[PDB]
């Protein structure tokens, strides 16, 4: 009965752990010990985006790497031109409680969501010279922590209902529901090929979901705290998770185990946002210590600190060409770093 | 120099700046409150996704938000006050309410947000105490070591036993309030009868005191 099922699950977990251990022979640290370090990385702030009157909770670069969307607690979604700091767009939201941003790959749409449990898709490039909500996707029983555009018609949104949902925007109804997390899902990262995505939750587990199949394929349990952020490696066969335990972790899709831990004795603040460089060599990690950190993704060595905010860094992003990294914090300021 | 289209884009950005400044000016004169409660505590009866209610007293506007926690409570960092509503008629869930208040008070992100405590049951507390069917000392064995202090502010129509029970519950919340506060925030305990109409005035006075404390704190007075 229940005892037999529990025993079977325990045996399966032990077998999975044994299989993972047998596939581990040399850590990436030993392999990359004979590699020249990145040295010291000194990014300087080139642009400061003022105009938000409340804590900035999310941002997303455009695929053209010049326009960036941002959401703050003042209930305004603002599209900035990063090169000139010009405000291309700034539109109000129905709910001031917004904690996620998404920029369509084509740039025709933006997305927002939060404590209203509704993902609002706004049409930017339209007639009548103003942006209006194109769609209101509802069906999540909890707050929306992240939303990502698969394409101009599909969107994957993770909620606090311990679930993720793939929606077709034209129909407005959930196409697929990804379940299996036992805690609030806090982040999701689309693969570069856009066929599977990793979602980190409050149960300190990161689950890899196949978008086409709709079922979880792998689960990674290395953290001991809620995973706030997740970011796919540019290759697409690895990812980095950042949790409240002040540690980042590198996981692999083909090795099924943690690769490196990015943590320090002088860091106790939780992670709020993670991102990778264009080549994936530098892992940018936003912290609660009001500043961001740069880690060597192959040697777990700190490369530099992006300290320009008077409050915690809440959102992080790197352009598709890697020219700049934009950090948005709770002091209502977005800073572009080169 | 920048081109004509770039000049017009800059002008559009300036107009957007002006609109955002105006919106922030209008939104700065409102006070945001976070309504919290466990269950059957009458949170919605305090003042007669997210349920948001706006009420104006003394020509000032108050926003009250209830969500129907450790993750979404982080968003309410700039909220002026957390209004915690407690049902004091029952005692089986009273310790659950105490643990809830301890968790909210000791939250990392709510370390500077003051709490207005509304012990929502006043008449029901009186009936429960006077009936004698339920022994309050059974749930809380501290009654033997607890005595009503000499300085008391009882109302005209009150019984010493009911007043003793009410003050015991208020003390049982304020010890948690004062245990780890560091002076950055203060709990404001109140008592309502779920029929009292002078509840928005109480929130108004408590928020005025909260704003005065913030002004004193960040202007070097405190």
């Amino acid at each position: 009965e229940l005892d037999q099922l529990r025993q079977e699950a325990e045996q399966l977990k032990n077998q999975i752990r044994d299989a993972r251990k047998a596939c581990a022979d040399a850590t990436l640290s030993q392999i990359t010990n004979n590699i020249d370090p990145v040295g010291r990385i000194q990014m300087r702030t080139r642009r400061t985006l003022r105009g938000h009157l409340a804590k900035i909770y999310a941002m997303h670069w455009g695929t053209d790497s010049r326009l960036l969307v941002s959401a703050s607690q003042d209930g305004k979604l603002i599209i900035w031109d990063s090169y000139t700091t010009n405000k291309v767009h700034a539109i109000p939201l129905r709910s001031s409680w917004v904690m996620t941003c998404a920029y369509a790959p084509s740039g025709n749409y933006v997305a927002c969501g939060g404590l209203d449990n509704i993902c609002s898709i706004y049409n930017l490039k339209t007639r009548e010279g103003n942006v209006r909500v194109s769609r209101e996707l509802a069906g999540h029983t909890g707050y929306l922590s992240c939303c990502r555009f698969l394409d101009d018609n599909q969107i994957v949104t993770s909620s606090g209902d311990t679930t993720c949902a793939l929606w077709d925007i034209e129909t407005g109804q959930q196409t697929t529901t990804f379940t299996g997390h036992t805690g609030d899902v806090m982040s999701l990262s689309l693969a570069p090929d856009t066929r599977l995505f990793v979602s980190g939750a409050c149960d300190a587990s990161a689950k890899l979901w196949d978008v086409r199949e709709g079922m979880c394929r792998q689960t990674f349990t290395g953290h001991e705290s809620d995973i706030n952020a997740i970011c796919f490696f540019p290759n697409g066969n690895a990812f980095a998770t950042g949790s409240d335990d002040a540690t980042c972790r590198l996981f692999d899709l083909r090795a099924d185990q943690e690769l490196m831990t990015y943590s320090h004795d002088n860091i106790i603040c939780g992670i709020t946002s993670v991102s990778f460089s264009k080549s994936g060599r530098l892992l940018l990690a936003g912290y609660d210590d009001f500043n961001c950190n740069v880690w060597d993704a192959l040697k777990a060595d700190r490369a530099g600190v992006l300290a320009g905010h008077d409050n915690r860094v809440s959102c992080l992003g790197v352009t598709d060409d890697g020219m700049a990294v934009a950090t948005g914090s709770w002091d209502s300021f977005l800073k572009i770093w080169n | 120099t920048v081109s004509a289209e770039d000049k017009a884009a800059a002008e559009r950005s300036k107009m957007i700046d002006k609109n955002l400044r105006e919106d922030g000016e209008k939104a700065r004169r409102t006070l945001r409150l976070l309504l919290l409660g466990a269950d059957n505590s009458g949170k919605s009866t305090i003042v007669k996704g997210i349920f948001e209610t706006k009420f104006q007293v003394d020509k000032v506007n108050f926003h009250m938000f209830d969500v129907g926690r450790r993750k979404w409570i982080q968003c309410f960092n700039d909220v002026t006050a957390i209004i915690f509503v407690v049902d004091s008629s029952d005692y089986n869930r009273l310790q659950e309410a105490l643990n809830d208040f301890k968790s909210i008070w000791n939250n990392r992100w709510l370390r500077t947000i003051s709490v207005i405590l509304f012990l929502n049951k006043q008449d029901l507390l009186a009936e429960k105490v006077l009936a004698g069917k339920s022994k309050i000392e059974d749930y809380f064995p501290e009654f033997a070591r607890y005595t009503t202090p000499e300085d008391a502010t009882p109302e005209p129509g009150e019984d010493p036993r009911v007043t003793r029970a009410k003050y015991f519950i208020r003390k049982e919340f304020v010890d948690i309030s004062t245990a780890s506060g560091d002076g950055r925030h203060i709990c404001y305990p109140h008592f309502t009868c779920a029929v009292d109409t002078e509840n928005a005035r109480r929130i108004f006075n408590d928020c005025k005191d909260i704003i005065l404390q913030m002004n004193l704190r960040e202007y070097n007075l405190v």
Partner: single-chain antibody
Amino acid sequence: VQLVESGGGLVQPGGSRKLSCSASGFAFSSFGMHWVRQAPEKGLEWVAYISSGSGTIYYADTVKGRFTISRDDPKNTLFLQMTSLRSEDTAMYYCVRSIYYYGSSPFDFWGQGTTLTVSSDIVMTQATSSVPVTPGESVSISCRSSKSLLHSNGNTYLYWFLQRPGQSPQLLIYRMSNLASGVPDRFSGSGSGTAFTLTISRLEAEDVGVYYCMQHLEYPLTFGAGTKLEL
């Protein structure tokens, strides 16, 4: 998405006439508006520009001081007041919307014209004025600017409009590369500084007309002479 203009008529020289442009279907307050006149025989000629929020005002060097362009956003309308009309001013006036941000396509919609009858700038020259074409073929037209339209920000401000005789001109390609919303993919603009071209592949019905290339680098906004297409 509608600009209906009223005014015009027989005005004696030296008189005054105010003509209006009612805008419906779009956010008129966020659009910078233009008055552009075209002579009965000549081509298009920009007259005046009122910015968004009325913060910026521009006039042509030929009507400065005697023309006054204004807007009423609450009423969603545009006004052009004229003083001291002359016989060299009698033309057909168009009200044009244009919104400026990154990636925008100004001169989107041109309203129907009002017929008015009174009785340093860079030069955009179109070498060809009329060419013979047949449907299904491939044609190319070109024009040259007095100075390079390329800017330090990498944007080359060149716009192509097709009149389609009997109707108001419409935007075809903007910034010399980008395509207007709703136009077919057959049109393609290209070129470099002081030498730009527009190529039309497999011309179909409702394609013949006069093609005007104009510059947005400097606000005098010189237009091309035009290039008529005939069967």
